Design a protein around this motif. Structure first.
Motif, short mmCIF file in Angstrom:
data_model
loop_
_atom_site.label_atom_id
_atom_site.label_comp_id
_atom_site.label_asym_id
_atom_site.label_seq_id
_atom_site.Cartn_x
_atom_site.Cartn_y
_atom_site.Cartn_z
N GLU A 43 1.15 -1.31 0.25
CA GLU A 43 0.13 0.28 0.42
C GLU A 43 0.76 0.87 0.07
O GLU A 43 0.15 1.68 -0.71
CB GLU A 43 -1.05 -0.02 1.52
N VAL A 44 2.02 1.01 0.92
CA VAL A 44 2.60 2.52 0.83
C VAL A 44 3.91 2.50 -1.02
O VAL A 44 3.48 3.53 -0.84
CB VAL A 44 3.94 2.49 1.63
N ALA A 45 3.75 1.47 -1.11
CA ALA A 45 4.75 1.73 -2.42
C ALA A 45 3.63 1.84 -3.64
O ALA A 45 4.06 2.59 -4.42
CB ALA A 45 5.76 0.27 -3.11
N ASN A 46 2.65 1.59 -4.20
CA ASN A 46 1.77 1.44 -5.13
C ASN A 46 0.30 1.92 -4.86
O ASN A 46 -0.20 2.69 -6.19
CB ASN A 46 1.38 -0.10 -4.99
N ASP A 47 0.25 2.79 -3.63
CA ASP A 47 -1.07 3.74 -3.25
C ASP A 47 -0.51 5.28 -3.06
O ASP A 47 -1.05 5.98 -2.68
CB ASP A 47 -1.66 3.31 -2.37
N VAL A 48 -0.09 5.18 -1.47
CA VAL A 48 0.10 6.01 -0.77
C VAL A 48 1.44 7.02 -0.88
O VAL A 48 0.88 8.23 -1.92
CB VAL A 48 1.27 6.05 0.23
N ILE A 49 2.41 6.72 -2.29
CA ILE A 49 3.81 7.21 -2.24
C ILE A 49 3.33 7.66 -3.43
O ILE A 49 3.37 8.66 -4.29
CB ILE A 49 5.19 6.53 -2.59
N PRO A 50 2.60 7.13 -4.62
CA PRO A 50 1.57 7.63 -5.63
C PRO A 50 1.05 9.14 -5.27
O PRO A 50 1.18 9.64 -5.96
CB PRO A 50 1.59 6.14 -6.64
#
Ligand SMILES: Cc1nnc(N2CCN(c3ncnc4sc(CC(F)(F)F)cc34)CC2)s1
Length: 466
Positions: A345-352
């Protein structure tokens, strides 16, 4: 079976009366886990589960709390005959611990939603015959204390709970289930999980509670949620006050997650005269470094979430990179799925989402933008480096092409002239993973080679035939 001195504060007519009860118990040789968990469960039930009739606070009368306490102690003392389990050396046996665990397990409703809110406390156990997974471990520890077994203590990782007991408190035993569909291992040690270097067992750097830390656990366990949109202000205030009590007495010293939970509560509603949330997240990290070999993931996740909510992109990236720097020295094992889900979720949702907003704000003229800061690009790279190193030597893989699409997008948010400024040494960065070492060349081109990035991150061997 309460002592006269435990009864004198009743009835409890307010939040502060509950705090006085906790303060009194914490001043005792052994705080009474059963009493305290029944009190919290009673007040939570009438502040979050059923507020009908509520006008200020749900008064806890001694008659009511004492009858619940009697129900629990009669159930345990009647079902566990201690004469069958002689105590060699003032310490408990694995058979006795297993027996208490079976007593709790066998008492539960045959079928229920194990992930429901408000099933954590001994109030839920007695009135609803329902406990969540860590609630069962806590109830085994409460039951053992009721039986006079001073050596049985709660053991906690970041996603699981069990007990310690025996000579020097050196034995471990599973007493509850973990996750969903996993086969239970109640009665066994946690050695195989420690030996395989999974996150679930923290390489052995898990918490071994004393009784005061067990009080801190039940306080962390309070759930103020009334529904998806609504928390009980009364339960938030109570949880926050009890966490400060524990903090002041020294009982959060070795409890990073409790410090992050308190910092979260202070962000929502700060207490005048108290440390800032940032100070508290940093004390959580310092606790993990001091007592647990800096082997915990969540101290950095709590810090990163705070910076994320405050749009401190630089500092959110740094804290997620730090989370990856912890995870890199673990093997990703079956039963670690919760931390995989969080990194995904951090890599693929939050950071983006953060970088998409940063890009819009840079278009509008922002200065000091994370997207123009090569140190922020370095944090992004270190985050992926730790995830790639985590995957090395793990019995199941981590990365796949779904991750690659977002990596390319995230890299592309930084102009080539910013990316070029990071120095990758064998802002300066050293990579630990072979995946990011092979990607170094590609990280600097004006146009990112999407296909070559994808190939390097997923170790995919071949491109489309036709
Ligand atoms: C970032 C984070 N925000 N919330 C986080 N939580 C919520 C609070 N949590 C916790 N807070 C205090 N103590 C514990 S002991 C434990 C493992 C369990 F449930 F016992 F099996 C979890 C946990 C779990 C992690 S990490």
């Amino acid at each position: 079976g309460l002592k006269a001195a435990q009864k004198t504060l009743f009835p409890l007519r307010s939040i502060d009366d509950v705090v006085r009860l906790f303060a009194a118990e914490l001043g005792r040789e052994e705080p009474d886990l059963v009493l305290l968990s029944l009190v919290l469960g009673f007040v939570e039930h009438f502040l979050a589960v059923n507020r009908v009739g509520l006008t200020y606070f749900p008064v806890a009368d001694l008659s009511i709390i004492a009858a619940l306490y009697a129900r629990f102690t009669a159930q345990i003392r009647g079902a566990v005959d201690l004469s069958l389990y002689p105590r060699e050396g003032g310490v408990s046996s694995r058979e006795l611990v297993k027996k208490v665990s079976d007593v709790i397990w066998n008492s539960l409703s045959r079928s229920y939603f194990k992930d429901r809110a408000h099933i954590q406390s001994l109030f839920s156990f007695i009135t609803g015959t329902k406990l969540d997974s860590s609630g069962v471990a806590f109830a085994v520890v409460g039951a053992c204390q009721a039986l006079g077994l001073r050596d049985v203590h709660l053991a906690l990782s970041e996603d699981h709970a069990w007990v310690v007991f025996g000579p020097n408190g050196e034995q471990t035993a599973e007493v509850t289930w973990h996750g969903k569909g996993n086969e239970d291992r109640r009665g066994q040690t946690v050695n195989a999980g420690v030996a395989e270097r999974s996150w679930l067992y923290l390489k052995g750097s898990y918490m071994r509670c004393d009784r005061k830390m067990e009080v801190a656990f039940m306080v962390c366990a309070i759930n103020p949620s009334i529904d998806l949109h609504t928390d009980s202000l009364e339960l938030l205030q109570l949880q926050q006050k009890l966490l400060w009590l524990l903090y002041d007495l020294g009982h959060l010293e070795r409890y990073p997650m409790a410090l992050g939970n308190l910092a979260d509560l202070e962000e929502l509603e700060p207490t005048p005269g108290r440390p800032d949330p940032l100070t508290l997240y940093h004390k959580g990290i310092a606790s993990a470094k001091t007592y647990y070999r800096d082997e915990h993931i969540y101290p950095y996740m709590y810090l990163a979430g705070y910076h994320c909510r405050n749009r401190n992109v630089r500092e959110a990236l740094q804290a997620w990179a730090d989370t990856a720097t912890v995870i890199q020295d673990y093997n990703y094992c079956r039963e670690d799925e919760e931390i995989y889900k969080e990194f995904f979720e951090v890599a693929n949702d939050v950071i983006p989402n953060l970088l998409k907003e940063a890009a819009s704000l840079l278009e509008a003229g922002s200065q000091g933008s994370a997207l123009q800061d090569p140190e922020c690009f370095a944090h992004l790279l270190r985050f992926y480096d730790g995830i790639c190193k985590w995957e090395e030597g793990s019995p199941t893989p981590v990365l796949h092409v779904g991750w690659a699409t977002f990596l390319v997008q995230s890299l592309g948010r930084f102009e080539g002239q910013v990316r070029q400024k990071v120095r990758i040494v064998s802002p300066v960065l050293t990579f630990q993973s072979e995946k990011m070492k092979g990607m170094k060349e590609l990280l600097v081109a004006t146009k990112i080679n999407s296909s070559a990035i994808k190939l390097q991150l997923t170790a995919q061997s071949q491109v489309q035939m036709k």
